[PDB]
Design a protein around this ligand. Structure first.
Ligand SMILES: CCCCCCCCCCCCCCCCCC(=O)OC[C@H](COP(=O)([O-])OCC(O)COP(=O)([O-])OC[C@@H](COC(=O)CCCCCCCCCCCCCCCCC)OC(=O)CCCCCCCCCCCCCCCCC)OC(=O)CCCCCCCCCCCCCCCCC
Ligand SMILES: CCCCCCCCCCCCCCCC(=O)OC[C@H](COP(=O)(O)O)OC(=O)CCCCCCCCCCCCCCC
Ligand SMILES: CCCCCCCCCCCCO[C@@H]1O[C@H](CO)[C@@H](O[C@H]2O[C@H](CO)[C@@H](O)[C@H](O)[C@H]2O)[C@H](O)[C@H]1O
Ligand SMILES: COCCOCCOCCOc1ccc(C(C)(C)CC(C)(C)C)cc1
Lengths: 68, 55
């Protein structure tokens, strides 16, 4: 279906690929290495519960007053 | 005859007591519900689910 050149990636000679840099002494920085810096929110979860309650309540209050 | 009078009097007293106290309590409750339904910041179990009921 396809010639061997397309599969192996070269017609005659296999060219050397420059390897990937590492940046010794620190973590890799890639699109997939970002969870090292940004975990899921874990610090303000209970504050999230409180603020969700208060937001619901205040919205309901002002909406009911407006409607009435 | 005063035995009959006292019987009638205390029957009427118990009737009035039960009826009037139930009506007054329900009326205060309904007024509170009117205050809180129009202000949903207060339409919450503000005293507690069992506290008010137990009291
Ligand atoms: C339920 C659907 C998902 C169930 C299982 C999936 C799951 O819960 O994963 C956690 C999932 C996401 O994880 P998470 O990081 O903990 O999310 C933060 C919570 O949403 C932050 O909110 P919360 O859940 O920590 O507390 C908010 C609070 C707020 O209480 C209120 O005042 C709301 C009153 C409603 C009446 O509501 C309640 O906790 C219980 C009252 C009923 C809601 O949270 C939920 O979806 C459950 C709460 C969603 C409620 C509204 C859904 C629309
Ligand atoms: C908007 C920013 C995306 C937040 C993604 C959170 C994260 O650090 O990213 C972590 C998540 C994966 O989470 P998990 O490791 O738990 O599977 O996604 C990624 O790994 C890369 C997301 C790339 C898109 C960036 C936008
Ligand atoms: C099957 C019925 C008949 C139809 C046959 C043709 C079907 C073609 C559709 C499939 C195409 C697949 O296409 C595929 O693309 C990749 C790209 O990642 C090529 O990949 C090639 O190039 C990359 C760089 O680009 C080289 O590093 C690699 O070594 C080399 O394989 C594959 O050689 C090719 O096979
Ligand atoms: C809208 O999205 C914003 C995109 O921009 C992201 C900004 O990123 C800058 C982050 O800045 C830093 C720099 C260093 C760090 C350190 C190295 C201090 C984090 C550490 C110690 C956890 C590795 C953290 C954040």
């Amino acid at each position: 279906p396809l010639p061997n050149a397309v599969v192996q990636g070269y017609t005659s000679v296999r060219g050397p690929k420059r390897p990937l840099d590492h940046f010794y002494g620190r973590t890799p920085l890639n699109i997939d290495t970002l969870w090292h810096w940004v975990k899921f929110p874990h610090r303000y979860d209970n504050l999230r519960f409180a603020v969700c309650f208060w937001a619901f309540l205040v919205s309901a209050h002002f909406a009911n007053k407006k409607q009435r | 005859m005063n035995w009959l009078y006292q019987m009638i009097y205390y029957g009427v007293r118990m009737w009035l007591v039960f009826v009037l106290h139930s009506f007054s309590l329900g009326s205060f409750g309904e007024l509170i519900t009117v205050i809180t339904d129009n202000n949903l910041i207060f339409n919450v179990f503000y005293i507690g689910l069992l506290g008010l009921g137990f009291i």
